[model samples]
Target: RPECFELLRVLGKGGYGKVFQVRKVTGANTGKIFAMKVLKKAMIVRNAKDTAHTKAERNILEEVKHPFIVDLIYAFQTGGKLYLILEYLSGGELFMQLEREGIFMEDTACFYLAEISMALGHLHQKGIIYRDLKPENIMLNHQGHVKLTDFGLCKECGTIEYMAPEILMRSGHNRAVDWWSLGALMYDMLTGAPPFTGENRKKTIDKILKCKLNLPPYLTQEARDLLKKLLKRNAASRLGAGPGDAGEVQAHPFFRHINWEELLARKVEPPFKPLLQSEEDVSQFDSKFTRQTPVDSPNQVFLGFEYVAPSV
Candidate 1:
């Protein structure tokens, strides 16, 4: 079945496997570009818990759908690996743009945050809380719209830069953590820095668990007020934690100008459009990954996981 696709550029690589940009050669849908994540099974199967987590991620990808969320087109497996075919957002990760420009204008940040809120709202309505969110996972499509890559935070030495206080203190958490993440991201975009940063992860988290926010002078009153509410150390007082969920966060005065209907419909143009050669463009992705040889060594054969999407 892997023969039905031709691997082009490598999009990502980590333990067990690599995510490659591929072109479907035959069957189902032909001649379409996709990002196929080929993950090895034995590495995950080494532990029953890790294997189950992998399955849940697959389930989440299949069940959840939204305009801003990445589309899982095909799910299949072979001898030793699992293949998850997803839409290729050639505009690359939001982190790329942030790296280019130290920060974004408040208008640009608001536009992206507004779109992100819609996705969070949809997830919350389904009773699913997306606790893992950051600029690295916020991918931009060719049209300049956002499409998140995947969930499940990697706790193996990555920065918990935007994590809420409740998570650090081992206090209770819910949908409010998502709103807290939004506020933290908002602050990062405006100030070109995180809400709290220390020499190490423990100290950084300790600061979040004990310290207060140092609001920047340049942020507008609306932005300041919204951040104050969302960044509250107390989860009970945090925005979007109540029954209203995302609606409460959306109602903030900072996002008052946003037209929810138009934004969800994608009728509102984004602030930046990725100049692409074609829908299959990989120019924007990192050359480090793109230049790697794409390959999927023998792996899985997960029963009931082989999914063929029909014109979605």
Candidate 2:
């Protein structure tokens, strides 16, 4: 029943709605916890712009299932809201970790980038474009492994700063956009920020469109070569754009030490693990988010939307 789970606390809030850490109150699943994502149908319906992307996120969540990606355990709808029961990742966002640690060493960055590359490669193999590949969307598990989340803005598109030149120019784009974002992400990890950020948003866009890459002196030649291939203005010439797809990227000298099979099986140990007190530990999450006031669902009914548990 819908009442079987008790909402515990708000984890975070975004354009879609609120995500809460919920605990199962009954049955064989009793005591088990999950992340409950509540999306207001009213908000989606009211904003015509959000409909396609909102639906796309849910559809993608329901379709693609991978170890490195966040899993959607249960999906159902209440009267005025849609609910998704997702795997609760207690370690928190990678973005926060980067913020706290500033820049990571090359090897550390390589570990993370290698894992993410495999994950994105898997997505591309499934023909799904993960437009949003920033640190904010990536979560870390207690083991410190990557668990990518947030599919709301991931409908075969890219953000401005991380966006490829083709996308910025409206020339045309494809899966290569993801490689470009990955390059931008790599730059962020190596340095403290993206390669092309100016003083303001306009300046950043202008620089991305016209400026030359200002690579830091600290970067190794291999890293620079990989970035050059990935950030190519011509999508056709990008690293992962070849017929081999992610295999091309995996073969790059930058990832020479990564064993694709072992990495996928998670045999490789992560460089750092979060110091979690217990399964319920929330220390890694931001204090402001953990301190938010919790609200009960309005429980209003909407047309043609109702919770139906899947038959076991």
Candidate 3:
């Protein structure tokens, strides 16, 4: 099965291994481009929680389907490594684009935020709280739509500045934790920096725990209200905190412009479009990764993987 796909170029790198932009050289879906995520099976930790992360990442990708989420096309494993064939998204990470822009207008922010909320709401409906929410995890397709990635963290992992007190103070926290992270993201969406980041790591955490939130005067009134509600100090009082959630968020005045039906159907136009010369284009990805050889090393083994989508 591993021999079926031809590695094209290195699209990304992670702790486990590199993600190669690949082409199905033979068999079903021949010649189609896909992302082959090659992670050595041996790299997976034996502890249940760690193994759970490995399983969760693979499982969630297969189980979930949303316009704003990546799709898992095929999954299999060799004696030493695991393979995940995913839909190739050429637009790459949102972080790079954000870096260039510095900050986005409210219109652009609303487009991305609305799409993210749709995905997050879908995950919450499945009783999954996405704890890791940041610019890096958000990937753009050629169509310029955003898809959340790296589900291995789930409720257990979080980025420092975006984390809620429940995650920082460290709880029996729920979807609310995601809302706080979303608030930080909202702040980041408006202002280039996150709500609370000071000197180094320790200072940022302390600031996050107790410092008063800062809001620039230029943001719209609705945006400010939404941020305040989402970043509310009290977890119980936070917007989208409870069991029945994003409905409250969708109802928020800040997102009043969104058409829920059209948003779900992906009829809403993206705020930015990544220039794609052709389907084979890998220009959107970093040269550092693209310059590397797309190869998988041989190894030991892990079990229970081998899967092929029914549609394939």
**Clash pairs (backbone) in predicted model 1:** 79-299, 80-298, 80-299, 80-300, 81-299, 81-300
TM-scores, all models, native as reference:
0.94, 0.91, 0.94
Query: Ten residues in a row with the worst lDDT in model 2?
Result: 300-309
Comparing 2 and 3 on lDDT, the stronger one: 3
Scored by CA lDDT, what does every candidate get? 0.82, 0.79, 0.82
Candidate 3 residues 212-280, lDDT tens each? 988899989999999999999799989988666887887898887899888788788888888888876
Off by over 4 Å in 3: 153-159, 299-303
Candidate 2 residue 17 Cα shift, in angstroms, is 1.1
Model 3: what TM-score? 0.94
- Model 1: per-residue Cα lDDT at residue 149: 69
- Sorted on TM-score, best first, the list reads 1, 3, 2
